[PDB]
Amino acid sequence: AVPSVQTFGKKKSATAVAHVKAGKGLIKVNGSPITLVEPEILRFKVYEPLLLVGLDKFSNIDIRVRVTGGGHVSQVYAIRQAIAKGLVAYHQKYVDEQSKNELKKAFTSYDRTLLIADSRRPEPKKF
Amino acid sequence: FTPVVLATPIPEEVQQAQTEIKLFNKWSFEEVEVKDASLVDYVQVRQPIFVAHTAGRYANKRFRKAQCPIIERLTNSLMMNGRNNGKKLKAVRIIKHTLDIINVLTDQNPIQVVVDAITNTGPREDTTRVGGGGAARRQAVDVSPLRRVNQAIALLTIGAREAAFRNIKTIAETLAEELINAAKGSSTSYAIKKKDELERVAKSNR
Amino acid sequence: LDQEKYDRILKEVPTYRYVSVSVLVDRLKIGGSLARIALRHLEKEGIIKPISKHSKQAIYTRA
Amino acid sequence: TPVTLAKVIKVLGRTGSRGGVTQVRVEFLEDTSRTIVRNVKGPVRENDILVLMESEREARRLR
Amino acid sequence: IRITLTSTKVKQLENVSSNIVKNAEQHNLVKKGPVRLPTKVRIHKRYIDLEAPVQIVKRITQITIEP
Amino acid sequence: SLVVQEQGSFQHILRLLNTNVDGNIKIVYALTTIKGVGRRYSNLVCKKADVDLHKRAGELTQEELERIVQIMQNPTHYKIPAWFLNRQNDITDGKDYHTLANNVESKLRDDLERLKKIRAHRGIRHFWGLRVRGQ
Amino acid sequence: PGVSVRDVAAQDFINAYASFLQRQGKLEVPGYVDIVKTSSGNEMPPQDAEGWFYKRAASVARHIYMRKQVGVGKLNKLYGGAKSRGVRPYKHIDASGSINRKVLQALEKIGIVEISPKGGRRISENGQRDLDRIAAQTLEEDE
RNA sequence: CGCACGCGCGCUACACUGACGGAGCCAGCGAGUCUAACCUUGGCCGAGAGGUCUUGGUAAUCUUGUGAAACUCCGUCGUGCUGGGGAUAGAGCAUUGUAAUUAUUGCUCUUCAACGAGGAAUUCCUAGUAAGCGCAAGUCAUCAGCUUGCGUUGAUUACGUCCCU
């Protein structure tokens, strides 16, 4: 179980693909270091599954973040998706599946902003 | 916290919000306690989220919007005026940039004085506009208990943004007073001045 | 009138509940532009604890 | 006044001019021997919680 | 040197589209791989290079005279 | 910052350059309180004196201004800005008048004295704008 | 560790290396980028007016270590600002280019950034090896 | 298109979530010369404007990843018809148009106005709708303000009937 997959999410028209394979455990989210992440407060807008399942299960992944689009509230609210999408690089081909039940109970209705397409649709103004 | 040693630089404070549970950089949510009968149920932090913006179809059925989230009902004490929502996205900053002063005054976690503060403005009585036929009088009746709530919470929506709009001091830092002694009737303030006037306005001409 | 603020701060930071520029307005001397200047040299005394930094919103906390 | 909590186990719909007023039947919340019919304006349903002020006022007209 | 089609009109594609893949074998002038263009409103625009005599692609062209 | 007070020194309102260039506004915008001096005249002094807009300003010394008298006192050699001023290389005279409170309005309206004594636009109708619009 | 140039923040690279350029004194002071403002989307010229130019002319130390353009009519597109037009909303900014003969022709004075032929400015090994001396006068003092 | 009055339209300013000096640099409905003067990607010419001294293009390539905006972070100012506004207007600059007049909008800098969310009445609102913010276009020789869109980021309050109609 290792996906060699660009797990794809459209950002409402765009290419929000996350490059996914196995790794070493080395978090690279958009160049700047975790010591000096430019929002000090929205720093914690990156970690939902690293307060739920723990830092013990998935320390063997190489996070990549490459999306097209964003602002205040989608750049540093939804690179949070990356540790629900590039932390979980553990479910297709190579390295053992066994941890599967707890990623299909705590990731079923948790936050549909990450684990499925967020339903903030575009804006037709009701003709 | 049994550390896994990394070649990627992470400080001491980043991983603290997991096992040492404080869902801000330095603030918790551990003590949800309530004295009176009005505002118990809707501190909806049960999913392990830092911000918890659950905005789905919580507006179609007739019961489910009572269970609407605390950021999506109750922490709307920050956005009410529209020159700051109309250049909108500067509006994430108030409570976390302000609340360490309230975390000094008899608060280990900042909800501890606020145990007996939010709920104890429990609304019991409010008139309706009587038809009257001429004389627009008022009747001794009861609304649902969301008015002295909104005399203390919707007057914190204005009381954080729109009563700090055009204020002598700043927007978010006139909130060094807004939840210190908001428990019971002081009557000497911007929102507590009409607190007796739900139990006497429906009592004076009844 | 030279260092009356020096004694009525070191004996009154554990009397004033906060440290800000509105402490100085009780004597009715200055309200003006010598305030956002004074946020980066005040706490070399060492009694009140700083917390956060932002260039558009420089906020600290009373102690 | 006693905060006479009225559990809203049954409800009579949504009427009025604007569609806000409501008739409400209540068997009591704390004890289970008061049987009071009331009127409350606004959104209420079956099996909720409300407040009524006085002791055992079975008043049927509160619009 | 190139060819550029011009396209203003989704329902009459499969007469020459199969003459590019299932019946371009009948004159042994092979093609280079077509990139799937993002179809703007429709423009189906093909491009063929010519290193050939005067006959074959102009046989596809000058028999296609039904104006 | 510095917890040090002084002995009757600082004022709050000055009287400087024949009018009120005040002791609560700086060189720059109290020369805007009097009409005729803008921002970058004394903000190009910042690359030579380092005095910007960030203070309550009953603090100025009359010897720093003497290296600004090296920029002021003769209006013919002393770095007068040339894409900046109120009226500047004028039809009126031809020089770049970065003048003062007593010397702007006397050096402002020789375009309004002119054109319809000359039969066109501003020599009767602006005098009508003084025989009617002035009283 | 593998401490490198891209793994530092926004101006803990530019304005943190400018804590040591003030002890050297190296770059060019222009004449009349000063009386003009630096752009159309501006209200007030910069404060410090001595650092003031070090904060601008070393902004290409990491921006073009990474990518390949800062232009003159080309930096219009990257630098759209807040142009309150009164009747219209904010819009796009056209910038200055005269005494970038003393500003953007002061970028090659440090030897970090040279000028690219695609349009813009590019980096060499002189801006990747010597930055392991001069930007690792910050990067090897953050380690 | 000149102004005793009066209305509406949108856009603002009446402030410290404000904008400013720079780094963190994203979209698409994308659109660009034939029997030629278009889109524009090299430094600088230039206080500034772009000419396209050049180049790339019959086109998701060359503009283009429209390196878009509101914007996030080191420095700027604690309430002073105010570092709020450029309101009105002048002087030092263009791309043009056979000439900028009743200046056609692109360009550097001062003049800094009424107005303390403003009496009556209200405009649209539910799983993607308020709310800002851009992009480029018939407006373009001077831009979009109207507009049709797309894109960016996306709040209190809710399933109800006539009280208005």
Domains recognised in chain C with CATH numbers: 1-63 (1.10.10.10)
- One DSSP character per residue, F13-35 reads ---BTTBB--SSS-HHHHHHHST
Q: Which nucleotide has its C1' atom closest to residue A12's CA?
A: H151
- CA dist., res. D9 & res. D34, Å (int): 13
Angstrom distance (rounded) from CA F127 to CA F109: 12
Residue with smallest Cα–C1' gap to H87: G86
> Which residues in chain C are closer than 8 Å to F54, comparing Cβ atoms?
33, 36-37
- Number of C-beta neighbours around residue A98 at 10 A: 7
Written as one string, the DSSP assignment of A95-120 is S---TTGGGTTSSSSS-TTTSS----
Q: What is the largest CA-CA distance in chain A?
A: 53
Nucleotide nearest to G73 (CA to C1'): H50
Dmax (CA) of chain E: 35
Distance CA G59, CA G79 (A): 13
* Contact indicator for C48, C63 with CB cutoff of 8 Å: yes
Which residues in chain G are contacts of B7 at CB distance < 8 A? Answer: 1-2
Domain D1-63 CATH (choose: 3.90.180.10, 2.40.50.140, 3.20.20.140, 3.40.50.300): 2.40.50.140
CA distance G6 to G17: 15
Residue A68's SS3 state is coil
Distance of CA A76 to the CA centre of its chain: 12
Question: Are B97 and C59 an interchain contact pair (Cβ–Cβ within 8 Å)?
Answer: yes
Q: Is B116 helix (H, G, I), strand (E, B) or coil?
A: helix
Distances (CA, A) of C35 to B174, C25, F11, F27, F109: 17, 11, 17, 19, 43
Return the CATH number of F13-78, one of 1.10.3720.10, 3.10.150.10, 1.10.8.50, 1.10.260.40: 1.10.8.50
Q: Do residues E29 and E56 make contact, with C-beta atoms less than 8 angstroms apart? A: yes
Which residues does residue D40 pair with via DSSP β-bridges, in sequence order? D22
Tell whether the torsion through CA atoms of D50, D52, D55 and D60 is positive or negative: negative
Q: Is A36 exposed, middle or buried (0-12, 13-18, 19+ CB in 10 A)?
A: middle
Show the DSSP H helices in E1-67 as ranges.
18-21, 56-62
Give the CA distances from residue D11 to residues D8, D50, G35, in Å, rounded to whole numbers and listed in that order: 7, 12, 75
Taking any CB pair shorter than 8 Å as contact, residues of chain F touching chain G are 39-40, 43-44, 46-47, 50, 52-54, 81-84
- CATH number where A116 lies: 3.30.230.10
Please give the Cα distance from B91 to A73 (Å, whole number). 11
- Which nucleotide is closest, CA of B168 to its C1'? H79
In the structure, how many helices (H) and strands (E) does chain G have? 3, 2
Instruction: Give the closest nucleotide to B167 (alpha carbon vs C1').
Output: H79
Q: Which residue is nearest to nucleotide H127 (CA to C1')?
A: B57
Nearest to G34 among F44, F52, F54 (CB): F44
Closest residue (Cα, C1') to H49: G94
Tally of domains within chain A: 1
Domain boundaries, chain E: 1-67
Q: What is the resolution of this structure in A?
A: 3.8
Q: Do C4 and F3 touch (CB under 8 A)?
A: no
Find the DSSP H helices in chain A: none
Give the number of domains in chain G: 1
CB-based contact B24:A44 (threshold 8 Å): yes
Instruction: Spell out the domain ranges in chain D.
Output: 1-63
Asked if B9 reaches chain G (Cβ–Cβ under 8 Å), the answer is yes
d(CA F3, nearest CA chain G) in Å: 25
**Residue type present at position B158:** I
Element (H or E) spanning A18, and its range? strand A16-19
Residues G1 and A33: their CA atoms lie apart, in Å, by 13
Domain that residue G121 falls in: 1-143
Q: Is B134 on the interface with G (CB under 8 A)?
A: no
| Residues 6+ away with beta carbon under 8 Å from F43 | F28, F52, F53, G44, G45
Beta bridge partners of G121: G115
* Closest alpha carbon within chain G to F41: G35
Q: B86: exposed, middle or buried (C-beta count within 10 Å: 0-12, 13-18, 19+)? A: exposed
**What are the extents of the domains in chain B?**
1-206
Report how far residue B200's alpha carbon sits from residue A79's, in angstroms, rounded to the nearest whole number.
Answer: 53
Cβ-based contacts of B93 with chain C (< 8 Å): 57
How many C-beta neighbours within 10 Å does residue A9 have? 18
